[PDB]
Amino acid sequence: KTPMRVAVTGAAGQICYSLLFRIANGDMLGKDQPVILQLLEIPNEKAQKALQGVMMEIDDCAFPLLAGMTAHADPMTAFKDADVALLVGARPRGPGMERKDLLEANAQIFTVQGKAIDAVASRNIKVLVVGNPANTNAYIAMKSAPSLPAKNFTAMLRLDHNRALSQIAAKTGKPVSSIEKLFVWGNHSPTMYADYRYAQIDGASVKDMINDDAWNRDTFLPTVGKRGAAIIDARGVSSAASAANAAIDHIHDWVLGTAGKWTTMGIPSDGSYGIPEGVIFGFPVTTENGEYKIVQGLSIDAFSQERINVTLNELLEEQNGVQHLLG
């Protein structure tokens, strides 16, 4: 059938090296769906060269679903008629880079990329921001694309979700495949809040199996929250492969549906749970018909609104600092 055009940023980087071959393999949009990859890297020769080699490798796999693949240096061309956009490329916080130097640098990447998507991408393109700071970058891009619907601008909280999903199965000794209703609120940061209060394994309450809140506050939350750094402790390098799986999961679920299951998505707030509007935020959502839907009525206890507080604040902080680039 009609192949979709998938534009992916930072194509020559680590996440993409794991991400690109599974997209081409059909992991992200189904096995009966051909794809046209439109890759974007910075215009530097060493980046583009590397981007050339990666393309040579993708071909060397003989993927029957790959109906096309082009390399770009301009977002304006890489975003042309894109149905989906994975914004993985972002400016790393180098030596001397204060939090403010990061937000300012990345803001300028995302207003530009956001205006290009706004201009040439599909009128209902699904955007997903992986490059950090994910949530604030998805917001910038979203604000920079007034012709596109805000809800199409999401941020990946699915890595934190799959990591909380991993910790629980480990603790419960239960298959990770059977964990129902787990989710994550807020920012994709250690400040995130993995909420296990509603999760169930075989209908049984996960919270009640563990039957230990000290584990929750002291072990589950900090482990998930700092898992990324633990990967760097072991591997010496970031978590490319798992982040790339999360993005596959995010788009796959968003597009193909969760059939009732709850999942996590950094989406623009509609004011639910008291979260200010237009704030890209981790929310438990169910997907269907190509769209998400926030899970409502969840009881937010003292411990939770407190954690939801710290994560929203950090986000509000980041929004404040990138406002001046959104003139």
Next chain:
Amino acid sequence: KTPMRVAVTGAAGQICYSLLFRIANGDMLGKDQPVILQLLEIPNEKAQKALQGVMMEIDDCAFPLLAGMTAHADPMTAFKDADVALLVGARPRGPGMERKDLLEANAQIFTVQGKAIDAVASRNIKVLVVGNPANTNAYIAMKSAPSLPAKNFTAMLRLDHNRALSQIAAKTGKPVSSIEKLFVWGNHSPTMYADYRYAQIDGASVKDMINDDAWNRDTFLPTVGKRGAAIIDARGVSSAASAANAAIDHIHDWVLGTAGKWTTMGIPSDGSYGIPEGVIFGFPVTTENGEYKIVQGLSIDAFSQERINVTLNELLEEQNGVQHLLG
């Protein structure tokens, strides 16, 4: 169903970083087949640490097919009850390493690993050697495992096959998915011989479409033959991702079958095409019922036996140098 136990070597390395997540995802043995990964790395702390991080990442993907995963430092334990073994780890030819220093180093890895598979693996384990020199390493291992059937010891020629598969679709402008009957003879080296004389696209003769033998001898063969190095020219690093796909393809096809299609496998010679017995060699094969079968009757013209000559000789050379380790 009954999960198979997949032992994979060099787990903390590059090929594996791309390989492991697709095995767990079910790309290699089917989506209804759970797997138990049994990972092996050298006993060094930095290797094992890295191997720990990779395992943390595999969990962070919440793969429903992954019924288990353990890290090892001993082949004797990593090979326990293994149904399939991907021998990806091998000693790199470092500075000052003459061809002889390589074969001697790698020989000593494969006799040891070959005796351990021989001892604790399944009585009909499928072995596949990715670590270079692939063919000669698969031979060493095979010879070191007299209790197991020789035919179970293969070497990956599927990367050269998928690269020849890529070059042809590129030249013909035809989908790589439609190229029938292409194959590769000999050693996994630039000395390999991609044979397009029998390939067909929609029943049509590929050779006759190109209608240019100078392209064959001067462009197709050298490009495929030196594609690996071209990847290092562009990327700055080896071809991890595509090699990892090839291994998925090799095992997948070997196990699930090619349904009539021809593919390439470095297998122990039975004397077909005049190739000496027990010589791991690229041969066009069709798979079924869990086993391969050499394509017979292919006409071997002057140009071909000549190329088949250079590749067998190189292999015979490598065999000669590793004999003294096979006491």
